[PDB]
Amino acid sequence: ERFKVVCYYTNWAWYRPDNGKYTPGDINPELCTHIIYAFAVLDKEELVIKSHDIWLDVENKFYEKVTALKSHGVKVLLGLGGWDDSAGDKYSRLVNNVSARRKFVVHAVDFLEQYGFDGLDLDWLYPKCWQVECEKGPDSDKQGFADLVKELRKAFNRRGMLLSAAVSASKRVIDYAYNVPALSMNLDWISLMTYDYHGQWDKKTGHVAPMYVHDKDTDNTFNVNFTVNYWINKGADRKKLVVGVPFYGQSFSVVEGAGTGLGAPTYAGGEAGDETRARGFLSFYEICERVKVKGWKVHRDPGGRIGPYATHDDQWVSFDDDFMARHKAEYVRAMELGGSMAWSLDLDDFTGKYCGCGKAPLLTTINHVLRGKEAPPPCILHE
Ligand SMILES: *[C@@H]1O[C@H](CO)[C@@H](O[C@@H]2O[C@H](CO)[C@@H](O[C@H]3O[C@H](CO)[C@@H](O)[C@H](O[C@H]4O[C@H](CO)[C@@H](O)[C@H](O)[C@@H]4O[C@H]4O[C@H](CO)[C@@H](O)[C@H](O)[C@@H]4O[C@H]4O[C@H](CO)[C@@H](O)[C@H](O)[C@@H]4O)[C@@H]3O)[C@H](O)[C@H]2NC(C)=O)[C@H](O)[C@H]1NC(C)=O
Ligand SMILES: CC(=O)N[C@@H]1[C@@H](O)[C@H](O[C@@H]2O[C@H](CO)[C@@H](O[C@@H]3O[C@H](CO)[C@@H](O[C@@H]4O[C@H](CO)[C@@H](O[C@@H]5O[C@H](CO)[C@@H](O)[C@H](O)[C@H]5NC(C)=O)[C@H](O)[C@H]4NC(C)=O)[C@H](O)[C@H]3NC(C)=O)[C@H](O)[C@H]2NC(C)=O)[C@@H](CO)O[C@H]1O
């Protein structure tokens, strides 16, 4: 009750080879206080919420099958947006027009109630910095988003619905996008997306979610600790801040002869995993498979500032393991924040067959720290 564990469920994890396949029946409600159903999308024409996958969400009742878990004491919200749906100006057009916001709020309330959702989690990435491009949006996206949140807050309070938002971890995006005091006041929690600080786009090996500054770092703001303290210094309520932990790694293909170190030049994303089928990232269970069966070498930071990374040939993937996930959850408790967020349920070793540290090892670890679930010690991968 004191700490939230916000779990992102992704509907497209259904369209995955049997061993990676994740359905609403795979959710363990004991491991979440709040489930976010990712994603719904904004209709480009009407600027209202709509299903991104009618066949799954509606025809096969995946919306209702997830909101049905509220009988376990879990709150279930619909996530609107995500990275891919945040392309273009549709959300900016929405928040900069008073008539469109008003029609969005009225429709959103009934859309959510029609499927039994307890609320809405805003995942516009990002106000003003459309898909991280801060030159694209107007400076007024900041107030428009703030005003959309205020108007949703007042409309939701009369219905008992929850309102939250997933937000960037980048200092520069925060400055352009977020009225931090207004958002903290009007949102039930703020999910800091404290990951994807580094990836194939840097063209150098880096860690997906550094905890503290590392000496090889070029920028001392690209770490979880800065993001949290920055939101606090910008005026945020500690108890509203929810620290996101990635259940997946950023993978790279390193230029030949550049070594296996941090900051080694890369020419492409890593080879795709069998289940996630996406160059540039691997699920946690795919990383376990590579360490246990394929002999990938785990490299750790003795200073505890970043999680591990794994290597084989010119492949390189940085990720959070059980030890770093425990630390980030312990960091939330030590800092008295709102809780932890998991992206995403399906990228954890939810079956337990890959990592051999029980079912949902990463999520179990977080629940152990924040909610007192007795658990085994962290699993050592190298073993
Ligand atoms: C996450 O991001 C945060 C936000 O930016 C980072 O914030 C920084 O946090 C550090 C905390 O470590 C803070 O540092 C100052 O904290 C207080 C400010 O009021 C000062 O007292 C601190 O001085 C101590 O540390 C200095 C070294 O930096 C040292 O020179 C100074 O003399 C004093 O040393 C004592 O404590 C050391 C640490 O244990 C001992 O090694 C040393 O021997 C001294 O010990 C004696 O005194 C203690 C009481 O003072 C006593 O308890 C002890 O037992 C012994 O008797 C320090 O300057 C920064 O201000 C803060 N930065 C900002 C910008 O806010 C945070 O670091 C980051 N986390 C991580 C993990 O990276
Ligand atoms: C030109 C140039 O070099 N520009 C750089 C710029 O690239 C650097 O900024 C970094 O940009 C990357 C994008 O290029 C940013 O990465 C974003 O990060 C988002 C986090 O805020 C992340 O979205 C959330 O997290 C999930 C995990 O990635 C997302 O899941 C993804 O969902 C998709 C559907 O929408 C799906 O298709 C994907 O498969 C899925 N991926 C996984 C692993 O599951 C999720 O959508 C989203 N969650 C929520 C709740 O909304 C984006 O996914 C990610 N995109 C990409 C393309 O990777 C990164 O944040 C930027 N870094 C920083 C620190 O700001 C910038 C920094 O240097 O430098 C510019 O020069």
Numbering used by the authors: 2056 to 2438
Task: Give passages from the manuscript.
ChtII is a GH18 chitinase and possesses the greatest number of catalytic domains and chitin-binding domains in this family. Here we report the catalytic properties and the crystal structures of the catalytic domains of OfChtII, the ChtII derived from the Asian corn borer O. furnacalis. Analyzing the domain structure of the predicted protein with the SMART tool revealed that OfChtII contains five GH18 domains and seven CBM14-type chitin-binding modules (CBMs). The other two GH18 domains (C1 and C2) are predicted to be catalytically active (CAD).
To gain detailed insights into the substrate binding mode, catalysis defective mutants were constructed and crystallized. The inactive mutant, OfChtII-C2 E2180L, enabled us to obtain the enzyme–substrate complex structure at a resolution of 2.4 Å by soaking the crystal with chitooligosaccharide substrate (GlcNAc)5. The complex structure was similar to that of the wildtype enzyme, with an r.m.s. deviation of 0.17 Å based on the superimposition of 383 corresponding Cα atoms. The 2Fo − Fc map showed clear electron density for (GlcNAc)5 along the substrate-binding cleft from subsites −2 to +3. A close-up view of the enzymatic cleavage region showed that the sugar residue bound at subsite −1 adopted an unfavorable “boat” 1,4B conformation, which raises the free energy of the substrate. The aromatic residues Trp2067, Trp2138, and Trp2256 interacted hydrophobically with the −2, +1, and +2 sugar residues, respectively. Additionally, all of the acetamido groups pointed away from their corresponding sugar rings, which suggests an energetically favorable conformation. In particular, the C2-acetamido group of the −1 sugar pointed toward the catalytic residue Asp2178, and the O1 and O6 atoms of the −1 sugar formed hydrogen bonds with the side chains of Tyr2250 and Tyr2303/Asp2251, respectively. The O6 atom of the −2 sugar formed hydrogen bonds with the main-chain amides of both Trp2138 and Asp2139. In the substrate complex of the OfChtII-C2 mutant, the corresponding aspartate turned to the other side as a result of the mutation of catalytic glutamate, which abolished the hydrogen bond.
